[PDB]
From Swiss-Prot, chains A, C, D, E:
Protein name: Intermediate capsid protein VP6
Pfam families recorded: Rota_Capsid_VP6
Region (Interaction with the inner capsid protein VP2): 62-73
Sorted UniProt keywords: Calcium, Capsid protein, Intermediate capsid protein, Metal-binding, Ubl conjugation, Virion, Zinc
Length: 397, 98, 397, 397, 397, 133
């Protein structure tokens, strides 16, 4: 594995620092490393493919070296080199892809392909170098084991969930009380509604609460919290809980009262914010709890009073809400987010080559399904597969 | 740094009899030399010597680095290898004069 | 061109690895490269500027080299160096800017300025090095020919378009059926409305469809698809198609039925998703097709039944919608996105120096106009101009 | 300070470039630098902590160098090294944290801790090197005196502000005219409402305006401007200005007329856009001014005419709005944004160790409070503290 | 830049210490320094001007040295010298002026002109000398970044502002209550008026307050505070707030009651004085708050009682006031004051040569406009430009 | 007292006439004066503060003199100097302030502080100069 990495920063820090011009000196420490490789290789036959629509190109090795008898690289030097790199490029591609599909329950955290199982071999370790690519940096630290970690802009921690819970309902659905929400990606929107506008509620206040349990702990999260749930601020016709009929939601929005957001870790409050909208920090949590209330306005102008009668029919439905977005955070486990192409790379290679569904990943690498049942096996396979995708993107995008 | 090295250099090259080398030449020769890398071999070794340099110097039998003056009836220390002696592997708290 | 690049990583990897203290050994391979430059230079004279409100500063060179002596940098060494760099800095700026404005129809993909036309010269090539800056990495590969590629967050592929199409309308605009949308940047929101709530429609279902054709193919796209179009979920007074009057839209939202998203490439379905909300991957496409339906609720509580009468007036307008956002994707062509400052840099330099409108780019480098008619000439000029902006940002932000 | 930096890229470019195998010569230039350090250190004792729940761990030095002999590193070489790095890791952490809390009103820009005050010492500067980490790159240029500059995404320039201004109101709040808005982070949404639909207004047009003054200038901003303010497009019951009662807002949305956005700098218009929605560039500004109008529709279908009577009661409230989002921008001052973890790191370390509120930063490092009164002292302390957080994240995430 | 300085103290300490008489030895240390210069120069070529009505002049060098021979100085020695100085005089003038007009947004700090950009060159640094000129003394310390400082008599910190605020008013403007003031330069005069003489006010006392926010902190300020605002002690006919009409102010003055002056820094009270008139010290502040009251006289002789009836018309308007003048203070930023000619020099050179308005400074170098929006760029440019003016005044007044 | 004065015009006519560029000889008469000081100092220790919110920092001395590397100064010369001046600056401040608070009815026209009472000492007078302030 670590092997694999080098093979690339080798080529990038190569196809990049080797051009018509420069002084040798820039590459002395480089050229060397390079050659070392060629040697170890030459003579070993490699096989890739043998699944779905994946060609089976075979590769032989018999390549010359790189004279160090020069100062300024003459064009002629480049071309006689690029021609030798373009075999490694078109190679690695066919290598990544091959181990970017196979899955294993028992040892999923390990290598699979007849291509890689041979790389972890000892006689090859003679290469490894310059491990500063965020992902490998983290692969290693995970095998000796310690405080690993990554960076994500608008991460993808919430499996898609869009539903409601009626705490008070009746067949006609003309006087409901409950909450409706949308948890997806890095965002949560939740609204609490009370058709009666807390007319018969103690202190004329109806309490609401929304709890979201993350499948992985997020640390160092920068979060935007805003009052109101725009998504649930418009008229809707919704299916009843049993699917037998449809109800009408005609919201009128009031400010959420006594807003309290708690970021908990193992049941303990790590961060708590009372009615603080804007940017807040949640430093370590596996659960978010949003509590908010609808308080019947004690003073109402005629126009307002008219919306909230003492008796049914209740035609304007009092609604309070919150919107929470995790802009950035760190997670000890790999996740999809709004900037990295890893998930898309893995999913794309599998789709393009018609790779059959395996025993670990959900059909189509479906994110919601994956994060909903993010087992240790899925995570180890995901990390292996994401790390390979990142190695590949250093050369092929 | 000047001549010294240059002289030997040319000599070993055989071909020319130094002397009749305009003084503008020998020095100019240095000016150019003092701008190149160094056979990894050569270089790689010097780096080595420097790192240990310190260690050798104090590690010798005859010769040590400087002495301190306190004019303060001071307590002699004791170290297995020398017995009752007045060393001190640490000068800190008193000016230093190269 | 490639020339230009070096001139920078030269300075950055310079103004960065050179400070009061450090051992020579961290720069031996560096110092060298540097000097090499100085030589090639001094002796040659330069001219930059002219066009628009841009000063014309003339530059001469003849700077002494360095020292390979001290194997432990003394402050005095730095200052005598920084003073020589600050002429190259204030130089390059005036260089980038000069070729960051000239455009050319015929062969407007190569160098233009009297400054650069002289750089591509052969006697200069003796510099090129460390091409690891994502953009140059891609410039080269394009020169030779190969699968290039860049990375973008919330890419800017959709020219702004906000409109509607009335499939059924009449003068009074009291019983309309059609769609309205907003395509902008990386997002699409589309709503299908039927004032009659499919009362006389076959199977009481009204079909809708929204097709968006990208001007460039996007690959490896991570996309968020959510039901509902919040933007079209509120009451509106809109201008009629002919601009002669205004109509009233009073939406009530129902869940979109039989949602099907197709990502097509040259007319072929590459990815298709049926009613899958949340995160989905579209691996290669030039067109997005969103199909969704409004199905009249077969069972309605009184409150719902009241919104949908058997006869006009239709006062509550049944609406179904979708929201699609491209979080990240790869494109073989340069594009503006939500993170990179390239477009803003180019646009800003042109605005600051009152650069006259040219023959290639739309007035003000207007993104919508540019992407709407993204001709080969505009793309080649944009790439040249974006690559220069990226070279400049390594030193001047 | 600069000292501190090195200590890290030292370790990263270390714990990264040293793996079982690699041919020596990839590190010769590296090993050296390393050792140099060890020397300078050994013999000097250090002290950290001493506040809140911050342990007072003590440290000492006395370590063997690193055999620069071998040609290919053997496993045994690594382990005898990693064991020496893990003391520097666990060290630096305790170092960063210590100076990542202390604050000073006067010279709150310089070093404070008994740990760092000793680092700026001269005998230590024998270490500095490879200052390519975006943040240090900028620290220096600032200490030297020049145009700094940082890169962002959905930056956090607007302190949270959600309010309204009634330009025409009366006790019953049945015929209001004014604006309501939400400024937060990188986004602004503003709506102008006129209950009378400009029935008695000159030219049947009501003018609106929203001005936002940034606490710091933003340059090279890529901005999305869209018509409509979805946040203010739904029915609301709002508290009156004096808090004595509640009013009803029942919006119906019309297109904003004569939209003009001005990005001003010191009172001067730098960029102006007339009705241009989509992506626009604002190259240098400290103020944004959004002007827009509500124009009573000159021609109305019956359904529309019915919403806007000649006499009260006014039951449908004409509303026009705008949404503006700063996707990316450059600022000469550090700021929180949607991608960087700096603010979250600083805030998190302080929260975890129960660090008492100090004299500079608002309680909890509250962003809104900080940006609202972004004094020079808060900025210097923030930059110091953000730069340290970035040094720490190179090793510990 | 520092270069520039020397060029002068060179000449002054020259055209001053060199005349028909004196012994050599009192200038030996001087002569030397001088010559050194000549050398560095000779051969080098210059250019100045080329902007607006500014003459473009070219200069060359080729001069003799000095007879370090003679014991005394014979007349003949002088003349052969003065003739060589008068070329440097008439030179420097044309040099200062050239860089005393150019402005720049990005690096508004550094040099601009083709004359100076060449001076900061390294080969010229061989000239610095005697920097006891208050301004250079401060220029340097600012590069090294440290607590600078200047000395000012009647400083110019308050942008001109002359207005009023009516806290109680009515159409007839026959019973007003509010304040009127004049903030200008180093002075503030503010009056609080109550047409009713607090007849219906709690405790028959009307409270007033005037807050002035400085654009820069002033330290070590010697201030004169006196009761009464003579400027607002006479009858006036004033324009109404809306400009639609004019009101009558007919003051009668009473002693200000419970006078409290607070000099605040970042919201904190640094100095507070209760009813202390005369000379007071404000050691560090960015805000001044003046609070004072009008207390209806509890005992009134007939003549007084007659001015203050229980019912309108109120014909004599009770007024209380304060006058505050900052005699001297120190500021870390350059400012105009009542003694220094810097602002006038810069403004005068620009006016005389018809220099076009630039991107940094307000038209005409208008002080009020400048101090009102005293941006970092304006301050850096102002300091550069003020320092040059001070260098010039050492030789040319 | 007069002592005190010098300590400054020393530094000003110093932090001013000493820049990356001037020829040595333009400061020969200056360098000298300077060193002379250093000598007299090093060794003797001082206390400042000890009143209200005034910090009590202890100042000790230990400094090497000044080179001369002919033909205008090299940057390296400056820095190794500025670093030695910045201890005298931050010092004097703490010195002035200490005797700028104590008062005395009887003989309150003379030195009061444990800092200055030691300066008027004789072994120090060897400094005074350029009294044009
Ligand atoms: Zn984003």
């Amino acid at each position: 594995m670590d092997v694999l990495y080098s093979l690339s920063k080798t080529l990038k820090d190569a196809r990049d620092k080797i051009v018509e011009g420069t002084l040798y000196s820039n590459v002395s420490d480089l050229i060397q490393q390079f050659n070392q490789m060629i040697i170890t290789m030459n003579g070993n036959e490699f096989q890739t493919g043998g699944i779905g629509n994946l060609p089976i190109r075979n590769w032989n090795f018999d390549f010359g070296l790189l004279g160090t008898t020069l100062l300024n690289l003459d064009a002629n030097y480049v071309e006689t080199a690029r021609n030798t790199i373009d075999y490694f490029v078109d190679f690695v591609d066919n290598v990544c892809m091959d181990e970017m599909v196979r899955e294993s329950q028992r040892n999923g955290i390990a290598p699979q392909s007849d291509s890689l199982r041979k790389l972890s071999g000892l006689k090859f370790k003679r290469i490894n170098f310059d491990n500063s690519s965020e992902y490998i940096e983290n692969w290693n630290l995970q095998n000796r084991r310690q405080r690993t970690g990554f960076t994500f802009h608008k991460p993808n921690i919430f499996p898609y969930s869009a539903s409601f819970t009626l705490n008070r309902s009746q067949p006609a659905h003309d006087n409901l009380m409950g909450t409706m929400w949308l948890n997806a990606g890095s965002e949560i929107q939740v609204a609490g509604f009370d058709y009666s506008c807390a007319i018969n509620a103690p202190a004329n206040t109806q309490q609401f609460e929304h709890i979201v349990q993350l499948r992985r702990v997020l640390t160092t999260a920068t979060i935007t919290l805003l009052p109101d749930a725009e998504r649930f601020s418009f008229p809707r016709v919704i299916n009843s809980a049993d699917g037998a009929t449809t109800w009408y939601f005609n919201p009128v929005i009031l400010r959420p009262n006594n807003v309290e957001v708690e970021f908990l870790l193992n049941g303990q409050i790590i961060n708590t914010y009372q009615a603080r909208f804007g940017t807040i920090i949640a430093r370590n949590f596996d659960t978010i709890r949003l509590s908010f209330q609808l308080m019947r306005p004690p003073n109402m102008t005629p126009a307002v009073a008219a919306l909230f009668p003492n008796a049914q029919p209740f035609e304007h439905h009092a609604t309070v809400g919150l919107t929470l977005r995790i802009e950035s955070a760190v997670c000890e486990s790999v996740l999809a987010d709004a900037s990295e192409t890893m998930l898309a790379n893995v999913t794309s290679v599998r789709q393009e080559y018609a790779i059959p569904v395996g025993p670990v990943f959900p059909p189509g690498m479906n994110w919601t399904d994956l994060i909903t049942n993010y087992s240790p096996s899925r995570e180890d396979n995901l990390q292996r597969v994401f790390t390979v995708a990142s190695i590949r993107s250093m050369l092929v995008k | 740094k000047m001549k010294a090295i240059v002289e030997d250099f040319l000599k070993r090259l055989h071909i020319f009899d130094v002397a009749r080398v305009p003084d503008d030449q020998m020095y100019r020769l240095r000016d150019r030399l003092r701008l190149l890398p160094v056979e990894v071999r050569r270089l790689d070794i010097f780096n080595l010597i420097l790192m240990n340099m310190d260690q050798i110097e104090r590690a010798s039998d005859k010769i040590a680095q400087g002495v301190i003056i306190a004019y303060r009836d001071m307590q002699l220390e004791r170290d297995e290898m020398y017995g009752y002696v007045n060393i001190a592997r640490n000068l800190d708290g008193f000016q230093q004069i190269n």
